[PDB]
Amino acid sequence: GSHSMRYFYTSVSRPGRGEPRFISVGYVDDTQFVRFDSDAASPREEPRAPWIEQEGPEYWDRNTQIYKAQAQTDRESLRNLRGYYNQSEAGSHTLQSMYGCDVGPDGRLLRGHDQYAYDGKDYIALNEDLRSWTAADTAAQITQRKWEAAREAEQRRAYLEGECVEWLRRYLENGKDKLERADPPKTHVTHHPISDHEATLRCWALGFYPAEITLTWQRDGEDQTQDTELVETRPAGDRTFQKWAAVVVPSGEEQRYTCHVQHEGLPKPLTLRWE
């Protein structure tokens, strides 16, 4: 199928309490597979999915040295950015980084990503051409000119077209059914009287992967959009996801209501009832 790999870095300054904390996580699609934390006792890249565990010592050692160097680089970036914005040297600030690749079923690169936020606001981003930058403001233009002089876009493009695509291909090969084959939801409807005249119907989707899902209540096969309570999709903690949708109905009218479930793992969309 189509697949993505993403790395997410967070650096948070803490002036007076030492160097910024740097955290990295890596994902294939909706599966976290690595972490690094600069505050760990002996910081190293650690596995977080079973199929990455087979990578040899050279992998872990290379990646650990990268994160240690990136933490120092982000520390310099946070110092430069509080200067660009004329900000107090006492305050805590956040630098976030997000990069990686989207590939099609043949493993070919569809899109590369390399972008940054400062204190939760977009700062600079590599354009879809993988050759030019979009800067948010005059501070980010300082970074843009520095990165143009250093030929940073060519370095990012080499990774995104090269190591990103090749390593994602590898992970999909080693992760087999865990990454390639969607896990459909386990579904059920519950019923909760509110009063003699009103009841809640709640449609559950549990244990599904990936996270993308649609749950809708219908009355006689028509969507009840404006009357459905829908919770945000949430992690079960075992790499699968949960969601529910609820509707309040007149007591004795439950039979008019059906829950429609759309998920990649389902052979076809499900229609569920209170039963």
Partner: protein, 100 residues
């Protein structure tokens, strides 16, 4: 500076069955900055050895964390999640409802 208020959901990994081992989850999402305090409570008291997911974020740069502990639900034991964040003028307490 951007400040976004956390969303909170408290829930079990598996449908609750009294006397059956499970996980209690408090999912905090959509927040900024990342500094956040999350306690799981049993009958109003802080649970020790609570673990959390590695700090991650969404395409809008907002952070998310899952806090979790192994637990055995009973009829009488009450569970909740207590969250403190710069955006909250008081701690936000969300009670566990086995039906949500």
């Amino acid at each position: 500076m951007i400040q976004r208020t956390p969303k909170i959901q408290v829930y079990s990994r598996h449908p609750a069955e009294n006397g059956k081992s499970n996980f209690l989850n408090c999912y905090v999402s959509g927040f900024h900055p990342s500094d956040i305090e999350v306690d799981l409570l049993k009958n109003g008291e802080r649970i020790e050895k609570v673990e959390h997911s590695d700090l991650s974020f969404s395409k809008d740069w907002s952070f998310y964390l899952l806090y979790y502990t192994e637990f055995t639900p009973t009829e009488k034991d009450e569970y909740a999640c207590r969250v403190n964040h710069v955006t909250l003028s008081q701690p936000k307490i969300v009670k566990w409802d086995r039906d949500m």
